Amino acid sequence: MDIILGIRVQDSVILASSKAVTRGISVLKDSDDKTRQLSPHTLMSFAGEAGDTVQFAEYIQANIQLYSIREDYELSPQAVSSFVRQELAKSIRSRRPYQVNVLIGGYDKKKNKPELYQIDYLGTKVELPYGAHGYSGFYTFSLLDHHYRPDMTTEEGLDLLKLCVQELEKRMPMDFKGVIVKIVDKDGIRQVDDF
Amino acid sequence: MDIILGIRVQDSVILASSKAVTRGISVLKDSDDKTRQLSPHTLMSFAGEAGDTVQFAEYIQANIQLYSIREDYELSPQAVSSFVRQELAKSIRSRRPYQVNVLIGGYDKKKNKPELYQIDYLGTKVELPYGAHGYSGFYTFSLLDHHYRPDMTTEEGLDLLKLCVQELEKRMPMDFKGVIVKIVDKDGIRQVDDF
Amino acid sequence: TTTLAFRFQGGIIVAVDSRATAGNWVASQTVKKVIEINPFLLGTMAGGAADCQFWETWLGSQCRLHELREKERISVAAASKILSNLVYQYKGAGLSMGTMICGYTRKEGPTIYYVDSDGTRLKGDIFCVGSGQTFAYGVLDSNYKWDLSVEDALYLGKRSILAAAHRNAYSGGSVNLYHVTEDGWIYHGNHDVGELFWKVKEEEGSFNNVIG
Amino acid sequence: SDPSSINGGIVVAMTGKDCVAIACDLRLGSQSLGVSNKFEKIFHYGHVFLGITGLATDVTTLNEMFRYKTNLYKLKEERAIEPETFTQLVSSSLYERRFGPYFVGPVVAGINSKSGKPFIAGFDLIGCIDEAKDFIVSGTASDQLFGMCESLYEPNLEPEDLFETISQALLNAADRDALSGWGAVVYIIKKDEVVKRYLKMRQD
Amino acid sequence: TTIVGVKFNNGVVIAADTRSTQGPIVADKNCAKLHRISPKIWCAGAGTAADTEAVTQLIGSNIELHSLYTSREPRVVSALQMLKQHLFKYQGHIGAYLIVAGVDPTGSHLFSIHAHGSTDVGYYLSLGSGSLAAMAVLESHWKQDLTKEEAIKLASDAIQAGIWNDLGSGSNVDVCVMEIGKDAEYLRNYLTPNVREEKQKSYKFPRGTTAVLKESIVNICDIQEE
Amino acid sequence: TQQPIVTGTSVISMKYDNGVIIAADNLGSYGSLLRFNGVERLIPVGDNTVVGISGDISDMQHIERLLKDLVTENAYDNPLADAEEALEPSYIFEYLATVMYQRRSKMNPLWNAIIVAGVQSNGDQFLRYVNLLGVTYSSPTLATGFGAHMANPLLRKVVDRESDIPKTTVQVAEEAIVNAMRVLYYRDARSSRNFSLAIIDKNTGLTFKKNLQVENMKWDFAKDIKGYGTQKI
Amino acid sequence: QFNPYGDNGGTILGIAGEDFAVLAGDTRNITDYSINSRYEPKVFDCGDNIVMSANGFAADGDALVKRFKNSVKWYHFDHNDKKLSINSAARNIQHLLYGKRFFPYYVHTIIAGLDEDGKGAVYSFDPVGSYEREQCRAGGAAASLIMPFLDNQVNFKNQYEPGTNGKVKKPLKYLSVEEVIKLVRDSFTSATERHIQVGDGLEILIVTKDGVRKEFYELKRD
Amino acid sequence: TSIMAVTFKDGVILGADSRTTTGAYIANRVTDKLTRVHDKIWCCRSGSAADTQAIADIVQYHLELYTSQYGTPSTETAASVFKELCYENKDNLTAGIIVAGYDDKNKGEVYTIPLGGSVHKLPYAIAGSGSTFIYGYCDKNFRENMSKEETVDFIKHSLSQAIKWDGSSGGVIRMVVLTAAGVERLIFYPDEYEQL
Amino acid sequence: TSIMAVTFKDGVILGADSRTTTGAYIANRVTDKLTRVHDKIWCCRSGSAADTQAIADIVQYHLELYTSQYGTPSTETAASVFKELCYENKDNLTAGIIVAGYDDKNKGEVYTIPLGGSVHKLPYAIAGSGSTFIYGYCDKNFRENMSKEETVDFIKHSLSQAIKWDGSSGGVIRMVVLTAAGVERLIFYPDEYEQL
Numbered sequence A, B: 001m002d003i004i005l006g007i008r009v010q011d012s013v014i015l016a017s018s019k020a021v022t023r024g025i026s027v028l029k030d031s032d033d034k035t036r037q038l039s040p041h042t043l044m045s046f047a048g049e050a051g052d053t054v055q056f057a058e059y060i061q062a063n064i065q066l067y068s069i070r071e072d073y074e075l076s077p078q079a080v081s082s083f084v085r086q087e088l089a090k091s092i093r094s095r096r097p098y099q100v101n102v103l104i105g106g107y108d109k110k111k112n113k114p115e116l117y118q119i120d121y122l123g124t125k126v127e128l129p130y131g132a133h134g135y136s137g138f139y140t141f142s143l144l145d146h147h148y149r150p151d152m153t154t155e156e157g158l159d160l161l162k163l164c165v166q167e168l169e170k171r172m173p174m175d176f177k178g179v180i181v182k183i184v185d186k187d188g189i190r191q192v193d194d195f
Numbered sequence C: 001t002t003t004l005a006f007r008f009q010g011g012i013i014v015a016v017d018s019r020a021t022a023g024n025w026v027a028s029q030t031v032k033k034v035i036e037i038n039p040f041l042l043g044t045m046a047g048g049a050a051d052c053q054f055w056e057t058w059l060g061s062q063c064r065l066h067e068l069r070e071k072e073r074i075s076v077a078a079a080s081k082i083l084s085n086l087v088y089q090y091k092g093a094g095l096s097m098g099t100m101i102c103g104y105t106r107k108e109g110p111t112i113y114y115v116d117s118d119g120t121r122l123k124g125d126i127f128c129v130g131s132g133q134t135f136a137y138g139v140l141d142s143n144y145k146w147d148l149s150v151e152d153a154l155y156l157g158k159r160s161i162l163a164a165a166h167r168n169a170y171s172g173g174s175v176n177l178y179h180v181t182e183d184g185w186i187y188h189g190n191h192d193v194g195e196l197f198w199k200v201k202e203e204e205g206s207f208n209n210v211i212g
Numbered sequence D: 001s002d003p004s005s006i007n008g009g010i011v012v013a014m015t016g017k018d019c020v021a022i023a024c025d026l027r028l029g030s031q032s033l034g035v036s037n038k039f040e041k042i043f044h045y046g047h048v049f050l051g052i053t054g055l056a057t058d059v060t061t062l063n064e065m066f067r068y069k070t071n072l073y074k075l076k077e078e079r080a081i082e083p084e085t086f087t088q089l090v091s092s093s094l095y096e097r098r099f100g101p102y103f104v105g106p107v108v109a110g111i112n113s114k115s116g117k118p119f120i121a122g123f124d125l126i127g128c129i130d131e132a133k134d135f136i137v138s139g140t141a142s143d144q145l146f147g148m149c150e151s152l153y154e155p156n157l158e159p160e161d162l163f164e165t166i167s168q169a170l171l172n173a174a175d176r177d178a179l180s181g182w183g184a185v186v187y188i189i190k191k192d193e194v195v196k197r198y199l200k201m202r203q204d
Numbered sequence E: 001t002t003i004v005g006v007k008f009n010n011g012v013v014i015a016a017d018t019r020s021t022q023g024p025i026v027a028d029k030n031c032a033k034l035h036r037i038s039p040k041i042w043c044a045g046a047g048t049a050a051d052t053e054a055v056t057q058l059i060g061s062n063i064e065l066h067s068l069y070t071s072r073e074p075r076v077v078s079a080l081q082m083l084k085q086h087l088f089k090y091q092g093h094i095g096a097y098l099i100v101a102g103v104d105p106t107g108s109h110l111f112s113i114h115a116h117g118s119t120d121v122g123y124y125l126s127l128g129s130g131s132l133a134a135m136a137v138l139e140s141h142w143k144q145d146l147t148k149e150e151a152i153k154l155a156s157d158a159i160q161a162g163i164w165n166d167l168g169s170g171s172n173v174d175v176c177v178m179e180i181g182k183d184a185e186y187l188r189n190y191l192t193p194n195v196r197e198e199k200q201k202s203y204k205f206p207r208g209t210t211a212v213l214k215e216s217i218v219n220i221c222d223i224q225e226e
Numbered sequence F: 001t002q003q004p005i006v007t008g009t010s011v012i013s014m015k016y017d018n019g020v021i022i023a024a025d026n027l028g029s030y031g032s033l034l035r036f037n038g039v040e041r042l043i044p045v046g047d048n049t050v051v052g053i054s055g056d057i058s059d060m061q062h063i064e065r066l067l068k069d070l071v072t073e074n075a076y077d078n079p080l081a082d083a084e085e086a087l088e089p090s091y092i093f094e095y096l097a098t099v100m101y102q103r104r105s106k107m108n109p110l111w112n113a114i115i116v117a118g119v120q121s122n123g124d125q126f127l128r129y130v131n132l133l134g135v136t137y138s139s140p141t142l143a144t145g146f147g148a149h150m151a152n153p154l155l156r157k158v159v160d161r162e163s164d165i166p167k168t169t170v171q172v173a174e175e176a177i178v179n180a181m182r183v184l185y186y187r188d189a190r191s192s193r194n195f196s197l198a199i200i201d202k203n204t205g206l207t208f209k210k211n212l213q214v215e216n217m218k219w220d221f222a223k224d225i226k227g228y229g230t231q232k233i
Numbered sequence G: 001q002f003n004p005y006g007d008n009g010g011t012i013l014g015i016a017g018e019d020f021a022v023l024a025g026d027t028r029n030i031t032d033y034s035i036n037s038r039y040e041p042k043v044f045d046c047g048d049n050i051v052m053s054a055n056g057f058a059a060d061g062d063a064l065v066k067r068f069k070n071s072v073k074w075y076h077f078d079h080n081d082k083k084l085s086i087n088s089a090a091r092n093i094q095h096l097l098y099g100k101r102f103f104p105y106y107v108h109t110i111i112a113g114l115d116e117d118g119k120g121a122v123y124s125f126d127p128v129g130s131y132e133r134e135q136c137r138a139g140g141a142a143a144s145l146i147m148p149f150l151d152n153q154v155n156f157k158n159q160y161e162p163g164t165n166g167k168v169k170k171p172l173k174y175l176s177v178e179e180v181i182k183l184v185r186d187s188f189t190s191a192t193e194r195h196i197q198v199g200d201g202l203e204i205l206i207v208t209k210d211g212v213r214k215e216f217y218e219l220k221r222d
Numbered sequence H, I: 001t002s003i004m005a006v007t008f009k010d011g012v013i014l015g016a017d018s019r020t021t022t023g024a025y026i027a028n029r030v031t032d033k034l035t036r037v038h039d040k041i042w043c044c045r046s047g048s049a050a051d052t053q054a055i056a057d058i059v060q061y062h063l064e065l066y067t068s069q070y071g072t073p074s075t076e077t078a079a080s081v082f083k084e085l086c087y088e089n090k091d092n093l094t095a096g097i098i099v100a101g102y103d104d105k106n107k108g109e110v111y112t113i114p115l116g117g118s119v120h121k122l123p124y125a126i127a128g129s130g131s132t133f134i135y136g137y138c139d140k141n142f143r144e145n146m147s148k149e150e151t152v153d154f155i156k157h158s159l160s161q162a163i164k165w166d167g168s169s170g171g172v173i174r175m176v177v178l179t180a181a182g183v184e185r186l187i188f189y190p191d192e193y194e195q196l
């Protein structure tokens, strides 16, 4: 289970993603960044089958970067999420589907609002205040159902996120080797180097 | 994978056993002692299928305690291990076999020697300087092949054991929630409360 | 199904939901997942309804026979082990049971045992069992402290079930609360989720995922 | 495994006197896990309303598809599509995927702008039309909805009465289904006004 | 489903019940199983409902275009040939079981079509889950040289046998009569022997009974001027 | 658990004003092979009961022996064996129904479908069904196998409910049964033309008719049927 | 391979009043798409003012009812003709069902009668013996159609008092026997319309302090 | 199904029962299994009704087009077209066909085409599920150069027995006579052939 | 295997081929399938060689013990013992047996016992894989009260055809004649019966 979490607060979106890469019986790496910057104000985390995850993320990244150059304009998070959903919805009826689940965290510069989209490998899109893929949601959703507000600050969002990670580290069976946390706001994307 | 390790040094046997009990997606407990004292100078650790492990251990414990009362005498570790092996060898051809692997660490008061026996659920017994069950051995055996001596002290044995646990915590995918360590020597059995 | 039980300063809190399902079909919203074995013993039910009901009422008969023969009450350890030894005989036959045997005696103090149809018997301070265990764990674990008040502890247990009733499709209906002390158990009422959810949302200011 | 019951959800439609009503729950889940309580299943193209139950990706995909087709229809025909015509378009569009179908249960509702006649219709996942006078049901609690509608429904109900009947049919059916609920929306549709109401229901 | 076809003196009649089912549940209590391929060629369908409708409309469309191309009224053997070759190509995966009947310049005709592409000719036929109940009636009461009135009676009686005795069939009886030298008469709900009795109680609720959170007007109109 | 080998097809029956009628063809099939052409599948018990059996014939012969042994056993130490304490249809049925449900519960069924037709001591008509699963039910008309699908519809046109029984004479009922047997010969691929029929009347007693044949069949219209569609010649 | 189970269809319904109780069931018996009987009784008077129905696989249902009737008989023999209370009957039936836990009676069982305080009682069972006292319960083929209607019209679920708008619930006023039979008849009339295994006839058994009474009503035969 | 074709002095006669089944239900008791692919080239159909109809329709098309270009085709030629379809599509077909025709040069000829798609020219042929029961009877009773009346009796007696023992066979006995005189259709009802 | 038993005026005759196979290999080409359970009660065996031998050995034991206590058993009695074994052990047996015997009171009798374990008393009976091909021939050619020489010819001609068409049947034709005169064994070789 490749833990990926997301929380949308007052003025930003926070994505947390596990660092472990386990192939069989061995943890091959404990510092893996399961995310790609699609545009300056849009970040996508991902989790699923080996190989497919990175291949899909980089493919999406390339397409959005192509759009940005062509139009000299950044697509809204809503527009990027719809593009991503269609690719997955197309993929599910292919010969060999992309087995990838994603969270898209973005800051809409037009509306001055943070936005979090959860999309699974079938192409099921939902906009949420907080989201998760895989087994993480079984612990974190109910926990966030209790501790979330729409008017929370970024610092309160991080404390709330620490609470989620602590619960996961206590009750989940695999060692996912901690998480890399990234914040998406009006100023762009930045990584929290100490978590 | 329910990590159980064992190392026989100069004058003692050291058993290390994981604390986690994971049923499905949740870690129900993080302080479980996977061992039973069979006699004052004989300790058995165990790992296998849920329910069977404890049922088997306590059954063996009861039998050895019965022998001790009847004869007013403690059986040698070799004798206890042979009894345990026969029970498992009997079990494997039963209607529903005991799905339990064990390590038996004991100090023979007659020969003044520590002894470590590794027995799997089929009834396969081997006397060893160091042993492990399940996937733990895939990491620890080669590591101990490099760092072991027959004339090591108990303190050197514990440092060597810390090295094994650190490697397991680094490369194994499940969080086994640390280990409970117990030492078996001429003075009996005692637990290392800080590890 | 969501059931929990945890040890604290004022004894034990036991909280359960009330839903029973058959596939996606909600068969009952009013089932009793706590069994009053005796004035100091409680049993929780998760998994097979019949299996849990039958063998835990059977357990009460065995506990009663114990105190007739021994002129003394049965320990929580002995009671839990009667049930675990019983299901171990049936292992492989297909019983489906996830139970907590909660109680108090003088020599043990407040005690909780998790007993399983796989034969697993575990002593511990906190347990959540059923299809909603993960959801209850999330709330319970993040807000648990050893020094809660009988009032705060009762609420936490109630709140943890509510959390799971909300997110878990196969949990819901209502919350049955119990509190176990030196002097036995005490019922703390049936709490319909249809009213409790909105009450908690308003008073606590949580559940912002919902339109209200 | 069964695509039609992974996400869960329900839709129901009813006719009344010079009016129609269409309603849906708000849940979206991954089997036991509830994920979203704002997943509306009713869409509208002009004055024609479409509810869709089943696999959520296909629900989203089909809405986008029928928005596409109805927009082109309007540009070419120079008029909004009617419910009878739209019903045939849904049937056609589903059957072209006969051996690789969308796992959905669509429901059309609306009033003919010319004749003023109330109209509802339902389909299976591959296109078969169920044009009923009284009511149409779809979703994981369709059995429950059939029982509620069949007992509660009476013909020629006034808009404000029809609202109560359909809302109670949905609510009580949803409460007997694990994969339905988490909120509900009801549309009351008249020839030149449409009211949308969010219902208060139990959130478990 | 119960569908039948009966030949008579100067034409042919087909009939069907009006129950539509999804497993043990009745989806539609007044389904129309009698389809039109051309004005004087009608067919009744059993099996997969979407398949019988789609295959009927397709062949009906191509029959119309063929009729226009040839400046001739369509023949039943043409519809029969086009249907069977289509169904055969799809190897039974299109679950359409049809009774095709009609009149044309050649005369009156009656055929059945199986989903794998086999056709059969007959004076009396029955298809669907109630075909055995219907065929028992047809085998008991059918005779040569039936009148129009006798054939309609026999057909509807055969459908009734399915309605009462088969759980897959029910509700009403539809009929279509195709006589030579005449317009075909479609008799929708020819019989209505299954009207629901008055309910003991009215379940009309008091206004305000349902709890509401939000109200809002929905904008169905286009973007406005000024 | 087994599979049926040599099998008997439909058994049909109905009540009428003064009694019951039951019938079944004389065939023992071996899959698609119409192997044995002289098999009696109606077995009388006393002068007031007839058991009609379909399904596996070896199991039928076993049941035949159980009933024969039942009569023997009932006569033991019973001076009223041919009078007040004679075997009733209700007794015989419940016995079989007990056996059938016991055998299915041991996962070793008697692969049959049975109809017990008879008249009770008080003149009441008895007609009840039981099969390999131990499932039982009663109705004015009863039929097994293909008869359930084709005969029941025809017999229910005569006796649609309980109130139609006194209105139904023995001539009308026998006519309906004989017609139904013809229809089954037209349409059941494992039926024979030859059959047996039994009437149990409260006044005239048990009338057992053997070597009956399906007659007045309609085949002439076959000559006009040519090809499968377009073939004129 | 031999399949020891079957499905005979049918639907049953138990409602408990303040001083009475009803247990209704349709009289149709089926296999697959055929009708076996239009009138085959499914609800039985078991003695001691207790009525019972075991719906699903009829062979198992008949066996269970037969065994429980036998249990009542031996309860009188063994305990000085003592009346078997409804709660004691329910517990006895649990053991009958759980005794075949590993080869179950494939039925939904419902019993009805009066408790020891004279109030109406209904008990509902799963196939392997889990039971619960309820005010209302439908069982069998069309149970999914009927139960939601009963939640709404018997327990006034999702119903509130006009003017308050969702603040105050509809009060739980008791239902008379005449009002209950109306809900039963409408429940079965509705179920007959939309479920193919339901129809032919409706037989209701009403239980009061005065005894066990029967009422029969016709249902659509298609 | 019970089908057969028998050559005799004046030409060839095709014979068949009229039963079509779905399991044990007789879907059609008056089926016509003797189908025309050319004026004096007919075939007997066994196996799948759909497959054999589709094949026979295609063959009739090929021989109609053959006739337009090259004149009347031989019976051997018709059997070759049947074979080509049955052999090349053997994986997807369940068709046992007997081809029978009359030339003036070659007179009566019979070709049988079993499941594989092989061709076998024979004096007479039998096929269908009911044929198994009359291998003994037909072998013992067949003679070359029989008369029309003798050949009709041979087919009638043979199919009578096939119908008697095979549940999948029954109804009427249809026959098609192919000679220089023309094409004669015959029919024989149960009351006639059962008492034989 | 092709086996048959035929009653006639003076008694009954049993007949059988001599082929035993393992797939397509003939393990024994001179098998004796006509086996004795009593002086004048014999049986024809088909199906599993092991099963039918074990059964016949047990029956012979039962009738030997019957004879010691109650005197000569009837043919019906012997068929009942066969039935009891075949019926009660139907799950584990593959045995198709024809029982044939001669009494002075009852004369020639024939009972056939197919797979299920049912019993059928008949004027004549046929069984085995090769019997399928002679249902038509035997039904048309059998008469009651035939002579010995006619019955031998009937069996010889019937089994000849069964052997001709069935690959599992072949070798010699063995026959056992049961009359008041005694027990006569007959044999007929390929060169004799193939040319029929």
Ligand SMILES: *[C@@H](O)[C@H](CC(C)C)NC(=O)[C@H](CC(C)C)NC(=O)[C@H](CC(C)C)NC(=O)OCc1ccccc1
Binding pocket: C001, C002, C019, C020, C021, C022, C027, C028, C031, C033, C045, C046, C047, C048, C049, C050, C052, C096, C130, C131, G104, G126, G127, G128, G130
């Ligand atoms: C939650 O764990 C809850 C606790 C019970 C004490 C109510 N259990 C269930 O809801 C459980 C589903 C579990 C296993 C996921 N449901 C049942 O046990 C169910 C209860 C009845 C009252 C609906 N019974 C059931 O499914 O029957 C078993 C069965 C089915 C068919 C044939 C034989 C036996």
Ligand SMILES: *[C@@H](O)[C@H](CC(C)C)NC(=O)[C@H](CC(C)C)NC(=O)[C@H](CC(C)C)NC(=O)OCc1ccccc1
Binding pocket: E114, E116, E118, H001, H002, H019, H020, H021, H022, H023, H027, H031, H033, H045, H046, H047, H048, H049, H050, H052, H094, H128, H129, H168
């Ligand atoms: C006798 O062999 C007869 C000859 C036909 C040419 C009339 N065949 C059948 O009756 C045949 C038997 C089956 C077992 C091959 N039945 C059918 O072909 C049947 C006819 C329809 C009208 C019911 N079709 C059928 O069962 O479809 C399925 C199928 C498809 C392909 C191959 C076999 C069966």
Ligand SMILES: *[C@@H](O)[C@H](CC(C)C)NC(=O)[C@H](CC(C)C)NC(=O)[C@H](CC(C)C)NC(=O)OCc1ccccc1
Binding pocket: I001, I002, I019, I020, I021, I022, I023, I027, I031, I033, I045, I046, I047, I048, I049, I050, I052, I094, I128, I129, I168
């Ligand atoms: C013809 O039916 C003949 C009659 C015997 C009584 C001689 N049977 C066989 O030849 C028989 C055919 C098989 C398919 C049933 N072959 C055997 O029985 C064969 C004989 C041995 C000596 C090779 N045995 C055999 O194949 O053993 C396996 C087996 C076991 C049980 C049932 C069938 C087959």
Ligand SMILES: [Cl-]
Binding pocket: E118, E119, F228, H020, H031, H032, H033, H049, H053
């Ligand atoms: Cl055909």
Ligand SMILES: [Cl-]
Binding pocket: I020, I031, I032, I049
């Ligand atoms: Cl041998």
Ligand SMILES: [Mg+2]
Binding pocket: A118, A119, A120, A124, A125, A126, D035
């Ligand atoms: Mg999702």
Ligand SMILES: [Mg+2]
Binding pocket: B118, B119, B120, B124, B125, B126
């Ligand atoms: Mg080992």
Ligand SMILES: [Mg+2]
Binding pocket: C164, C165, C166, C167, C168, C169, C170, C171, C172, D203, D204
């Ligand atoms: Mg829930």
Ligand SMILES: [Mg+2]
Binding pocket: D174, D175, D176, D177, D178, D179, D180, D181, D204
């Ligand atoms: Mg719900």
Ligand SMILES: [Mg+2]
Binding pocket: G192, G193, G195, G196, G197, G198, G199, G200, G220, G221, G222
């Ligand atoms: Mg009905």
Ligand SMILES: [Mg+2]
Binding pocket: H163, H164, H165, H166, H167, H168, H169, H170
């Ligand atoms: Mg036949």
Ligand SMILES: [Mg+2]
Binding pocket: I001, I046, I047, I128, I129, I130
């Ligand atoms: Mg053989």
